[PDB]
Enzyme design. Structure first.
Site, PDB file in Angstrom:
ATOM      1  N   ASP A  37      17.611 -15.399   3.778  1.00 18.74           N
ATOM      2  CA  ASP A  37      18.645 -14.644   3.625  1.00 18.74           C
ATOM      3  C   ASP A  37      19.073 -14.875   2.102  1.00 18.74           C
ATOM      4  O   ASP A  37      19.619 -15.817   1.652  1.00 18.74           O
ATOM      5  CB  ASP A  37      19.745 -15.048   4.448  1.00 18.74           C
ATOM      6  CG  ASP A  37      21.147 -14.100   4.093  1.00 18.74           C
ATOM      7  OD1 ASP A  37      21.109 -12.943   3.604  1.00 18.74           O
ATOM      8  OD2 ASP A  37      22.297 -14.426   4.822  1.00 18.74           O
ATOM      9  N   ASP A 221      20.047  -8.242  -0.962  1.00 16.36           N
ATOM     10  CA  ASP A 221      20.261  -8.944   0.280  1.00 16.36           C
ATOM     11  C   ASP A 221      19.069  -8.897   1.221  1.00 16.36           C
ATOM     12  O   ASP A 221      19.142  -7.774   2.173  1.00 16.36           O
ATOM     13  CB  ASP A 221      21.590  -8.704   0.709  1.00 16.36           C
ATOM     14  CG  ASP A 221      21.791  -9.477   1.900  1.00 16.36           C
ATOM     15  OD1 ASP A 221      21.087 -10.170   2.332  1.00 16.36           O
ATOM     16  OD2 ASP A 221      23.013  -9.499   2.730  1.00 16.36           O
TER      17      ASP A 221
END
Ligand SMILES: C[C@@H](N)Cc1ccc(O)cc1
Length: 359
Positions: A37, A221
């Site tokens: 992440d 992201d």
């Protein structure tokens, strides 16, 4: 420096459930699958026998675990995760042959965090200390890695859309892309924040104040599936794609799927990003193959946002993406695993600084 065969194909996933890497924590090593992440900064792992988990961090089995005697609580709109802080020895088997002492949040309580049927048990936050919880004094994993070893301060992601990919830690693998890398400055070191300076649908400008493309912020992201666009921009984007492909009204809002029998009516989307040089930009071009994600039923993989632009897996899967932390920049090249996706420059764009939104 340009070849990392050990790290090629080190990522796995399921469509919509993110990409994960194998990691080991503690001594003796406990193998865990961990969500990659770039939109968060905590290394957090299941530490209790939650029914959805194949495995979890068992602190009692580790002789190198050190209690930090401090809790951490991460709320979401949906649910949350909560855990106890500590440090332990961490390796990445299909990564650099090193071991680091890193902060770990042992998750003891969560809601809507672990997915029923997924093969991962934790999250590796690869962004900066500024957005770490509970505060910026909790050193993120990658900082610890760089501080303690000779691994260079950069990583790259090749996300190939069940799914697979590569996370090259400490370098770039040149076989993972074609053409040239183009770099955009990291605007601030918290999220991987960048600046979008122009948006085209089918080669036609949206003609919006560029500040709104970044209204709030724009980030890269890997933990988000969709291309997320600021409300006003999404409004204009949909209206332009709609007019380029003249379907139910709720489909565009992600309120229902659309099914077909087992592309060209849909336009290409170009995002122009701020370049390394004053008045110089470059553009990335994504295909309808990217923003129409199969669940033949497809979910429109662009959606509105109140947190700014999010360049999620949808965008990233078309590209080799270099998180060049040492030089505060993000590189984009056409992925060797993605009409074709394109990265092109240079272009002349004036007043690019004005595109950044200020507090
Ligand atoms: C990717 C993370 N920052 C957010 C997230 C966490 C758990 C989950 O099931 C879905 C999303």
């Amino acid at each position: 420096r340009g070849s990392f065969v050990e790290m090629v194909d080190n990522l796995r996933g399921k469509s919509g459930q993110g990409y994960y890497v194998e990691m080991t924590v503690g001594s003796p090593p406990q193998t865990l699958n961990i969500l990659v992440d770039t939109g968060s900064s905590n290394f957090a792992v299941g530490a209790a026998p939650h029914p959805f988990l194949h495995r979890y961090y068992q602190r009692q089995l580790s002789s190198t675990y050190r209690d930090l005697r401090k809790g951490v609580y991460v709320p979401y709109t949906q649910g949350k995760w909560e855990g106890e802080l500590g440090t332990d020895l961490v390796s990445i088997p299909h990564g650099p042959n090193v071991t680091v002492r890193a902060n770990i949040a042992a998750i003891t309580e969560s809601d809507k965090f672990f997915i029923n049927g997924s093969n991962w048990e934790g999250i590796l936050g690869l962004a900066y200390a500024e957005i770490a919880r509970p505060d910026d004094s909790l050193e993120p994993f990658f900082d610890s890695l760089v501080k303690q070893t000779h691994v260079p301060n950069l990583f790259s992601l090749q996300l190939c859309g069940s799914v697979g990919g590569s996370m090259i830690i400490g370098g770039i693998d040149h076989s993972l892309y074609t053409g040239s890398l183009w770099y955009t400055p990291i605007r601030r070191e918290w999220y991987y924040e960048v600046i979008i300076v122009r948006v085209e649908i089918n080669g036609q400008d949206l003609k919006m104040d560029c500040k709104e493309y970044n209204y709030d912020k724009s980030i890269v992201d890997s933990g988000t599936t969709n291309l997320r666009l600021p409300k006003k921009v999404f409004e204009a984007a949909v209206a332009s794609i709609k007019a380029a492909s003249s379907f139910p009204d709720g489909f565009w809002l992600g309120e229902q799927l659309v099914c077909w029998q087992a592309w060209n009516i849909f336009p290409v989307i170009s995002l122009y990003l701020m370049g390394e040089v004053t008045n110089q930009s470059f553009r990335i071009t994504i295909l309808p193959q990217q923003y129409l994600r199969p669940v033949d039923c497809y979910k429109f993989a662009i959606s509105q946002s109140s947190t700014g632009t999010v360049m999620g897996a949808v965008i990233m899967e078309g590209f080799y993406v270099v998180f060049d932390r040492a030089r505060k920049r993000i590189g984009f090249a056409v992925s060797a695993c993605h009409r074709t996706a394109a990265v092109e420059g240079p272009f002349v764009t004036l007043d690019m600084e004005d595109c950044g939104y200020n507090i």
